[PDB]
């Protein structure tokens, strides 16, 4: 029978295929590393502005991310050839233990030691107060039942509010159309006091007669709920408390100054102590701290707040566990299915060209090793072929 020897040859060709697959992937990782090296040589041109460095860093980050994708996705018959350290044993002979081994290695940004390769420089960070304006409505529904017992001093038979309360975002005062049944000259506009907790509505200031001139011209909003000033940073403040943040919060406008004295404006931020949390101002004028949304850590869905830090002082970072990653990386990430990781780059990498060449050398010996194993498989295939040919041409 020849079929057992041809199966071994078949296995041997799979061994070549998996080595060639790994080799094509490493040639790609190598290209990405050479580009990263060009960028590193470019970044060392001191005439570069910080904005130039940020741009070069973005492309270095793209290159490193691609390397990580290649490492994670490259496969042969499902075998993720560069996602983990593993020795693959391939039966190329007729009997037990007669195999050729392919030592596969996990090759990625981290194992290559370039996971925090950074060429950026810190900007001088500063801010200026940005006064938040307008109001937003809460969950507190305006309870009007309590009005008629607070307006007994108007008299008559019955005092009832006609319709919805009119709010005034210029003063924060609420007003009411009031029909006083039985009264003489008591119908008109009244200012009402609103319980900012449960929403109760009561005649304000023990008014004994309607406002002179009726409803103020600034009282144009018809509210069904208690208004809260966007300046109280209701949600932002609750998020800061739940995060364990102690200081008083304030909304500021960020500014960043490079080494040449040039400053650009940043976005809005919620300043707390010395820390800055990137924020966004919503439709209604309210403000919310940026969050990133991620899976697990030690099991389950969670959330962290985006602070402004990183290697440049303006990168959205995030603290999970006892670490601080970039938010870009941390978004949609699973630390259960994929733990172990480097935080965000903290400073500029010392001797980056040395580090990139060491990564280029790692990739290269692996490639030389794989080419050597292909050679071993070719030798097996030849001997299997000579045996089978002899049997085929005979009997």
Coordinates of C-alpha atoms in Angstrom, one line a residue:
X1 CA 0.0 0.0 0.0
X2 CA 1.1 3.5 -1.0
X3 CA -1.7 5.5 0.6
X4 CA 0.0 5.8 4.1
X5 CA 3.1 7.2 2.5
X6 CA 1.1 9.6 0.4
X7 CA -0.8 10.8 3.4
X8 CA 2.6 11.6 5.1
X9 CA 3.6 13.5 2.0
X10 CA 0.2 15.3 2.1
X11 CA 0.9 16.2 5.8
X12 CA 4.5 17.3 4.7
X13 CA 2.9 19.7 2.2
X14 CA 0.6 21.1 4.9
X15 CA 3.8 21.7 6.9
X16 CA 5.3 23.7 4.0
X17 CA 1.9 25.6 3.6
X18 CA 1.7 26.6 7.2
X19 CA 5.4 27.8 7.1
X20 CA 4.8 29.7 4.0
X21 CA 1.6 31.2 5.5
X22 CA 3.6 32.3 8.5
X23 CA 6.4 33.7 6.3
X24 CA 4.0 35.8 4.2
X25 CA 2.5 37.3 7.3
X26 CA 6.0 38.0 8.8
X27 CA 7.1 39.6 5.5
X28 CA 4.0 41.9 6.0
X29 CA 4.9 42.6 9.7
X30 CA 8.4 43.3 8.5
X31 CA 7.2 45.9 6.0
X32 CA 5.2 47.6 8.7
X33 CA 8.3 47.6 10.9
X34 CA 10.4 49.2 8.2
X35 CA 7.8 52.0 7.8
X36 CA 7.8 52.4 11.5
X37 CA 11.6 52.7 11.3
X38 CA 11.3 55.5 8.6
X39 CA 8.8 57.3 10.8
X40 CA 11.2 57.0 13.8
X41 CA 14.1 58.5 11.7
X42 CA 11.7 61.2 10.6
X43 CA 10.6 62.0 14.1
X44 CA 14.2 62.6 15.1
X45 CA 14.3 65.7 12.9
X46 CA 14.2 68.4 15.6
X47 CA 12.7 70.9 13.2
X48 CA 9.4 68.9 13.6
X49 CA 6.6 70.7 15.4
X50 CA 4.6 68.8 18.0
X51 CA 1.7 68.6 15.5
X52 CA 4.2 67.0 13.1
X53 CA 5.1 64.5 15.8
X54 CA 1.5 63.7 16.6
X55 CA 1.0 63.0 12.9
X56 CA 4.0 60.7 12.7
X57 CA 2.8 59.0 15.9
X58 CA -0.6 58.4 14.4
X59 CA 1.0 56.5 11.4
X60 CA 3.3 54.6 13.8
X61 CA 0.2 53.6 15.7
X62 CA -1.6 52.5 12.5
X63 CA 1.4 50.4 11.6
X64 CA 1.6 48.7 15.0
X65 CA -2.1 48.1 15.0
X66 CA -1.8 46.4 11.6
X67 CA 1.0 44.2 13.0
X68 CA -1.4 43.2 15.8
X69 CA -4.2 42.4 13.4
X70 CA -1.8 40.3 11.3
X71 CA -0.7 38.5 14.4
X72 CA -4.3 37.9 15.6
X73 CA -6.0 36.9 12.3
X74 CA -3.4 35.1 10.2
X75 CA -4.3 31.4 10.0
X76 CA -3.8 28.1 8.3
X77 CA -6.7 25.7 8.6
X78 CA -7.7 27.8 11.6
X79 CA -4.3 27.7 13.2
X80 CA -3.5 31.3 14.3
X81 CA 0.2 30.9 13.4
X82 CA 1.4 34.1 15.1
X83 CA -1.1 34.5 18.0
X84 CA 0.7 32.2 20.3
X85 CA 3.9 30.3 21.2
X86 CA 3.3 26.7 20.1
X87 CA 5.2 23.8 18.5
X88 CA 3.3 22.1 15.7
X89 CA 4.3 18.4 15.2
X90 CA 3.6 17.1 11.7
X91 CA 3.8 13.4 10.9
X92 CA 5.9 13.0 7.8
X93 CA 7.0 9.4 8.3
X94 CA 5.1 6.1 8.4
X95 CA 5.5 5.5 12.2
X96 CA 4.9 7.1 15.6
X97 CA 7.0 10.1 16.6
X98 CA 8.3 10.4 13.0
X99 CA 7.6 14.1 12.6
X100 CA 9.0 17.5 11.7
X101 CA 8.3 20.3 14.2
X102 CA 7.3 23.9 13.5
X103 CA 8.0 26.3 16.4
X104 CA 5.4 29.1 16.1
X105 CA 5.8 32.3 18.0
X106 CA 3.5 35.0 19.2
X107 CA 4.6 38.0 17.2
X108 CA 2.9 41.3 18.0
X109 CA 3.6 44.8 19.1
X110 CA 4.0 43.7 22.6
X111 CA 6.2 40.6 22.1
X112 CA 8.3 42.8 19.7
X113 CA 8.6 45.4 22.5
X114 CA 7.0 48.3 20.6
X115 CA 3.6 48.3 22.3
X116 CA 4.3 51.8 23.8
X117 CA 6.7 53.1 21.1
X118 CA 6.0 56.8 21.2
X119 CA 7.7 59.8 19.5
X120 CA 5.3 62.5 20.8
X121 CA 6.1 65.3 23.2
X122 CA 4.0 66.8 25.9
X123 CA 2.1 70.1 25.2
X124 CA 1.9 72.7 27.9
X125 CA -1.7 72.1 29.1
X126 CA -3.9 75.0 30.2
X127 CA -7.5 76.0 30.5
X128 CA -10.0 78.9 30.8
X129 CA -13.4 78.8 32.4
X130 CA -16.3 78.1 30.0
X131 CA -19.6 79.2 31.7
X132 CA -22.3 76.7 31.0
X133 CA -25.8 78.1 30.3
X134 CA -29.5 77.2 30.0
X135 CA -31.6 74.6 31.8
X136 CA -32.6 70.9 31.3
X137 CA -35.6 69.0 32.6
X138 CA -35.4 66.2 35.1
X139 CA -37.5 63.2 36.0
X140 CA -39.3 65.4 38.6
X141 CA -42.9 66.0 37.4
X142 CA -44.5 69.3 38.3
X143 CA -47.1 68.4 41.0
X144 CA -49.9 71.0 40.9
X145 CA -52.4 69.6 43.4
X146 CA -50.6 71.4 46.2
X147 CA -51.4 74.9 44.6
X148 CA -55.0 75.5 45.8
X149 CA -54.1 75.2 49.5
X150 CA -51.2 77.7 49.1
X151 CA -53.5 80.1 47.4
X152 CA -56.3 80.3 50.0
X153 CA -55.2 83.8 50.7
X154 CA -56.6 84.8 47.4
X155 CA -59.9 83.6 48.5
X156 CA -63.1 83.1 46.6
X157 CA -64.3 79.4 46.2
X158 CA -61.5 77.8 44.2
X159 CA -58.0 78.6 42.9
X160 CA -56.7 76.5 40.0
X161 CA -53.8 76.7 37.5
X162 CA -55.0 77.0 33.9
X163 CA -52.7 74.6 31.9
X164 CA -48.9 74.2 32.0
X165 CA -46.5 76.3 34.1
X166 CA -44.4 78.8 32.1
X167 CA -40.7 78.7 32.9
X168 CA -38.3 81.7 32.5
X169 CA -34.7 80.6 31.6
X170 CA -33.6 84.2 32.3
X171 CA -34.5 84.1 36.0
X172 CA -35.3 80.4 36.8
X173 CA -38.8 81.5 37.9
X174 CA -41.9 79.6 37.0
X175 CA -45.3 81.4 36.5
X176 CA -49.0 80.3 36.4
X177 CA -52.3 81.3 34.8
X178 CA -54.7 81.3 37.7
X179 CA -58.5 81.2 37.7
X180 CA -59.8 82.2 41.1
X181 CA -63.5 81.0 41.2
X182 CA -65.6 83.4 43.3
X183 CA -62.9 86.1 43.4
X184 CA -63.0 89.7 42.2
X185 CA -59.9 90.9 40.4
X186 CA -57.8 87.8 41.3
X187 CA -57.4 86.1 37.9
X188 CA -54.1 86.6 36.1
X189 CA -50.4 85.7 36.3
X190 CA -48.7 84.4 39.4
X191 CA -45.2 83.3 40.2
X192 CA -45.1 79.8 41.6
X193 CA -42.5 78.1 43.9
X194 CA -41.3 74.7 42.7
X195 CA -40.1 72.1 45.1
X196 CA -36.8 71.0 43.4
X197 CA -37.0 67.5 44.9
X198 CA -40.6 66.2 44.4
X199 CA -42.0 68.8 42.1
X200 CA -44.7 70.5 44.3
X201 CA -46.2 73.8 43.0
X202 CA -47.3 76.5 45.4
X203 CA -48.2 80.2 45.1
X204 CA -45.0 82.1 45.7
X205 CA -44.3 85.1 48.0
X206 CA -47.7 85.1 49.6
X207 CA -48.9 87.1 46.6
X208 CA -52.3 88.8 47.2
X209 CA -52.9 90.0 43.6
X210 CA -51.8 89.1 40.0
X211 CA -48.4 90.3 38.6
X212 CA -48.5 93.8 37.1
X213 CA -48.2 93.4 33.4
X214 CA -49.1 89.8 33.4
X215 CA -46.7 87.1 32.3
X216 CA -43.0 88.3 31.8
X217 CA -41.7 88.2 28.2
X218 CA -38.9 85.9 29.2
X219 CA -41.3 83.2 30.5
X220 CA -41.8 81.4 27.1
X221 CA -41.2 77.7 27.9
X222 CA -44.1 75.4 28.9
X223 CA -42.7 72.9 31.4
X224 CA -44.2 69.7 32.8
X225 CA -41.0 68.9 34.8
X226 CA -38.6 70.7 37.2
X227 CA -35.9 72.5 35.4
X228 CA -32.3 72.2 36.6
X229 CA -29.5 74.5 35.7
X230 CA -26.9 72.9 33.3
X231 CA -24.3 74.7 35.4
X232 CA -24.9 72.4 38.3
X233 CA -23.3 69.6 36.2
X234 CA -25.9 67.2 37.4
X235 CA -24.8 64.0 35.5
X236 CA -21.2 64.9 35.2
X237 CA -21.0 65.4 39.0
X238 CA -22.8 62.1 39.7
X239 CA -20.3 60.3 37.3
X240 CA -17.4 62.0 39.2
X241 CA -18.7 60.8 42.5
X242 CA -19.4 57.3 41.3
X243 CA -15.8 57.3 39.9
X244 CA -14.4 58.1 43.3
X245 CA -13.4 61.6 42.3
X246 CA -13.2 64.0 45.3
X247 CA -12.8 67.6 44.2
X248 CA -15.2 70.2 42.9
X249 CA -15.9 70.1 39.2
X250 CA -15.9 73.0 36.7
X251 CA -16.3 73.2 32.9
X252 CA -13.3 74.6 31.1
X253 CA -12.0 75.1 27.6
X254 CA -8.6 73.4 27.0
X255 CA -5.6 74.9 25.3
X256 CA -2.3 73.3 24.3
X257 CA 0.9 75.1 23.7
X258 CA 3.8 73.5 21.8
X259 CA 7.6 74.1 22.1
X260 CA 7.3 77.1 19.8
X261 CA 4.8 79.1 21.8
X262 CA 2.0 78.2 19.4
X263 CA -1.3 77.3 21.1
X264 CA -4.4 75.6 19.7
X265 CA -7.8 75.3 21.5
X266 CA -8.9 71.9 22.7
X267 CA -12.4 70.8 23.6
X268 CA -14.5 71.2 26.7
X269 CA -13.4 69.5 29.8
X270 CA -14.6 68.9 33.4
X271 CA -11.7 70.0 35.6
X272 CA -11.4 68.3 39.0
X273 CA -8.3 69.0 41.1
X274 CA -5.5 69.0 38.6
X275 CA -7.1 66.3 36.4
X276 CA -9.1 67.0 33.2
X277 CA -12.0 64.8 31.9
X278 CA -12.9 65.3 28.3
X279 CA -16.4 66.3 28.1
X280 CA -19.1 67.0 25.6
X281 CA -22.0 69.5 25.6
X282 CA -25.3 68.0 24.6
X283 CA -28.3 69.3 22.7
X284 CA -30.0 70.9 25.7
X285 CA -26.8 72.6 26.8
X286 CA -26.0 70.0 29.5
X287 CA -22.6 68.5 29.7
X288 CA -21.4 64.9 30.0
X289 CA -18.0 63.4 30.7
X290 CA -16.8 61.1 27.9
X291 CA -16.9 57.3 28.6
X292 CA -15.6 54.5 26.4
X293 CA -17.7 51.3 26.9
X294 CA -15.9 48.0 27.4
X295 CA -16.4 44.3 28.2
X296 CA -15.1 42.4 31.3
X297 CA -12.0 43.1 33.4
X298 CA -12.5 40.2 35.8
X299 CA -16.0 39.5 34.3
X300 CA -18.8 41.8 33.1
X301 CA -19.7 45.0 31.3
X302 CA -18.2 48.2 32.9
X303 CA -17.4 51.9 32.2
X304 CA -14.6 54.4 33.0
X305 CA -14.2 58.1 32.5
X306 CA -12.0 59.7 29.8
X307 CA -9.3 61.8 31.3
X308 CA -6.9 64.0 29.2
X309 CA -3.3 62.6 29.5
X310 CA -1.1 60.4 27.5
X311 CA 2.3 61.1 26.0
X312 CA 1.2 64.4 24.7
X313 CA -1.0 65.7 27.6
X314 CA -4.1 65.7 25.4
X315 CA -4.8 62.0 24.7
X316 CA -8.0 60.5 26.1
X317 CA -6.9 57.9 28.6
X318 CA -8.8 55.8 30.9
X319 CA -8.2 54.0 34.2
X320 CA -9.3 50.4 34.4
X321 CA -8.2 48.2 37.3
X322 CA -4.8 49.7 38.4
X323 CA -4.0 50.7 34.8
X324 CA -4.4 53.6 32.5
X325 CA -4.9 52.8 28.8
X326 CA -5.7 54.9 25.8
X327 CA -9.4 55.2 25.3
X328 CA -9.0 54.3 21.6
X329 CA -7.6 50.9 22.6
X330 CA -9.9 50.3 25.6
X331 CA -13.1 50.9 23.5
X332 CA -15.1 47.6 23.1
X333 CA -12.3 45.6 24.7
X334 CA -12.6 42.4 26.6
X335 CA -10.1 41.8 29.5
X336 CA -11.7 38.4 30.2
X337 CA -11.3 37.0 26.6
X338 CA -8.1 39.1 26.1
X339 CA -6.4 40.3 29.3
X340 CA -2.6 41.2 29.7
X341 CA -1.9 44.6 28.3
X342 CA 0.3 47.7 28.3
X343 CA -1.1 51.0 29.5
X344 CA -1.0 54.2 27.3
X345 CA 2.5 55.5 26.5
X346 CA 3.5 57.9 29.3
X347 CA 6.6 59.6 27.8
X348 CA 8.8 59.6 24.6
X349 CA 10.6 56.3 23.9
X350 CA 14.4 56.4 24.5
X351 CA 16.5 54.8 21.7
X352 CA 13.5 53.9 19.4
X353 CA 15.7 52.9 16.5
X354 CA 17.5 50.3 18.7
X355 CA 14.1 48.9 19.8
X356 CA 12.8 48.7 16.2
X357 CA 15.9 46.9 15.0
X358 CA 15.6 44.4 17.8
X359 CA 12.0 43.8 16.7
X360 CA 13.2 43.5 13.1
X361 CA 15.9 41.0 14.2
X362 CA 13.3 38.9 16.0
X363 CA 11.0 38.7 12.9
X364 CA 14.0 37.9 10.8
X365 CA 15.3 34.9 12.7
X366 CA 11.8 33.5 12.8
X367 CA 11.7 33.8 9.0
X368 CA 15.1 32.1 8.6
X369 CA 13.9 29.4 11.0
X370 CA 10.7 28.8 8.9
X371 CA 12.6 28.6 5.6
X372 CA 14.9 26.0 7.2
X373 CA 11.9 23.9 8.3
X374 CA 10.4 24.1 4.8
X375 CA 13.7 22.6 3.6
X376 CA 13.2 19.7 6.0
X377 CA 9.7 19.1 4.7
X378 CA 11.0 19.1 1.1
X379 CA 13.5 16.4 2.0
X380 CA 10.8 14.2 3.5
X381 CA 8.6 14.7 0.5
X382 CA 11.4 13.6 -1.8
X383 CA 12.1 10.4 0.0
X384 CA 8.4 9.6 0.3
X385 CA 8.1 10.3 -3.4
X386 CA 11.0 7.9 -4.3
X387 CA 9.4 5.1 -2.2
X388 CA 6.0 5.5 -3.6
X389 CA 7.3 5.7 -7.2
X390 CA 9.1 2.4 -6.7
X391 CA 6.0 0.7 -5.4
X392 CA 3.8 2.2 -8.2
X393 CA 6.1 1.1 -10.9
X394 CA 6.1 -2.6 -9.8
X395 CA 3.7 -5.5 -9.0

